[PDB]
Symmetry: C2
């Protein structure tokens, strides 16, 4: 009913707050086609927040669009979606969708959620709401577009996004859009591990991982992704592993909010720590082997388990292992062979994993290794001498 809403009444998504990606819409409008702003920004802008990306949408063949920007630095590849560069600014320019494409209204339906589907045009300063969009955005409601049941089945990932946005923005998930999940959760295991990875970092790294974890668990959507971990929760609720994941997420959340670059390998080596430590002690007694070699074995075990669900890059995995290895050495009350560690490119991680280990296990013996490497890592060579 309320399809087109004008500048004065829409929380002024004030023209001037649009990264000059207007210069790209202009070349479109000034070229016969029409161009719009969708999801990402238009959502945030209308809310109030500082948008985190501007995505334009046009009705120009992904072909015509390629022609109109020969002078421009457009990073090709990939169908429908055309890319354009400036500085630390890249502009997504996707053609509508629907023989394939068609109206701006046809496109508004293939999109996932309501709020993420509001259109803005700089030409008339109006925003088109061909979905609950506006109302939902107002009430703080994440609502899936078509028939939940059907869409989820078509692309199970949508279940994850539905919960992610729900935790990222501070709103509740739509009723008819929430029911299906607990059931269909299982449906993710049919997804390339390559992807469940990509989409997993967008959940926990991204800066809202604590809340997003509170949800991914309360919708059994955590199960499919992290079996190796699910397995160890204690109905109790205070397992030291459980605490570790909660904290490491609150902390990784702080970092991302205070702009501090973060480690993806750290995250995993933190979550999978106790389960690793468990499979370590298990193979120890069940095969009377030496601890250092039992643990060294367990690493391979836990990884190809997780790796089975989340395709983790061989890159990140190497580090992880190291972040763990150091958890051994760093305890052995070492001597003049410690400088060697203080130097490891991973000492920082390893340390911060020991910061936590001592924090959650409220173990005084461990918390000593930390108060020690605490001094020894910031000390100066003279004192660092004596210390050893």
């Amino acid at each position: 009913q309320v399809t087109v809403i004008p500048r004065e009444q829409h929380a002024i998504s004030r023209k001037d707050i649009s990264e000059n990606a207007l210069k790209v819409m202009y070349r479109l409008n000034k070229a016969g086609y029409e161009a719009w702003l969708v999801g990402g920004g238009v959502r945030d802008l209308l809310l109030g927040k500082k948008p985190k990306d501007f995505d334009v949408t046009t009705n120009a063949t992904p072909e015509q669009v390629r022609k109109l920007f020969r002078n421009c630095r457009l990073v090709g590849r990939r169908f429908r979606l055309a890319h354009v560069m400036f500085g630390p600014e890249i502009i997504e320019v996707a053609t509508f969708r629907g023989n394939i494409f068609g109206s701006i209204e046809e496109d508004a339906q293939r999109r996932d959620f309501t709020i993420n589907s509001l259109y803005y045009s700089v030409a008339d300063f109006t925003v088109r709401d061909y979905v609950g969009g506006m109302k939902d955005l107002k009430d703080g409601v994440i609502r899936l577009i078509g028939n939940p049941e059907t869409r989820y089945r078509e692309d199970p990932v949508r279940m994850l996004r539905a919960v992610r946005f729900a935790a990222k923005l501070g709103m509740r998930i739509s009723p008819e859009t929430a029911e299906p999940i607990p059931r269909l959760a299982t449906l993710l295991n049919d997804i390339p591990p390559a992807r469940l990875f990509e989409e997993s970092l967008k959940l926990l790294q991204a800066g809202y991982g604590y809340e997003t974890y509170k949800l991914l668990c309360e919708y059994h959507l955590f199960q499919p992704l992290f079996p190796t971990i699910t397995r160890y929760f204690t109905e109790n609720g205070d397992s030291p592993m459980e605490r570790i994941i909660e904290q490491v997420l609150k902390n990784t959340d702080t970092r991302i909010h205070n702009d501090m670059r973060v480690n993806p390998a750290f995250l995993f080596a933190a979550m999978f720590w106790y389960p690793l430590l468990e499979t370590a002690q298990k193979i120890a007694q069940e095969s009377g082997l030496t601890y250092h070699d039992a643990f060294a074995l367990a690493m391979n075990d836990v990884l190809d388990e997780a790796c089975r669900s989340l395709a983790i890059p061989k890159r990140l995995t190497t580090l992880t292992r190291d972040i763990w290895q150091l958890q051994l050495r760093m305890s052995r009350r070492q001597g003049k062979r410690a400088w060697k560690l203080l130097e490891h490119p991973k000492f920082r991680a390893a340390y911060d994993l020991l910061a936590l280990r001592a924090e959650v296990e409220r173990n005084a013996e461990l918390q000593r290794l930390v108060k020690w490497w605490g001094e020894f890592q910031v000390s100066a060579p003279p004192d660092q001498k004596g210390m050893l």
Copy 2:
């Protein structure tokens, strides 16, 4: 004299300590060529220690050493002196010198010091002492070769080497080999700037820099190199700049010896600190403007006149700029920018410069900033937050 010494009369020097340049010498010997092991390690082997390098000399022309090795990996270039590469152990094979190329007695002549001219042949397990070498190396005396006065004028840098070895091994410089230095020192500003740099680092950044600095001051060899510094020495003997330098050395020494790695950008940024700080006081209290901007000129000046003597690469200077910059940033008690700062690459250095600035000045309003940044960088995010 005693020209040749047998393996039964010369310190261990058992062929089994000669890593495997042996395979480079054998290939020559099998070809009707002379293989002598000369220089550093050949000296050390006698003392007992372990050779840090293995170089070899032969009566084979450089274009001959090329044929008999066209197979192996020759990191060629460099007239004379061919480069054989095993990998983490590269061997140098250089041709005898003189009309151009000559014999072993001829080569032993154009060689700087005594102990650095003993030859060894796997062929007959004998060391060749054409120069004083043996005696010198026993008594522990750094004696030059020909006529001190003329060789120093030939290549002034030779004097720097004189102290360098004098410091490294625990030996004394020969009387005749010393007399000229105080007088001839000034001959160093007639030496390319970039070249001094090499030889400057070869002195301090070599893990002997404390003993080598003292010997550079006692022979007035320091002055020609770091004019910008000499200028602020105080008659009283131990100012704050005069402690800062002895410490940065004693420490950069400690590191190198406990096989750590070391930042040169740091070494300098430390020495030249107070001087910069001095050009700040004047540039400020005169032509009076803001301490920040004043301090910004103080940098360009110091580096300019300092880089007039030493040729510090644009690279190194830029990191020096940083370490200094951070000394103010870190100064002002504050936060939220803190993380944005803790993430700075040259932060590790900056901290350690404050480490010293506090030690030397004994000022408890700095040792205070240290006890802070010290704790703010070892504790995890929950505390790192409350500390602001």
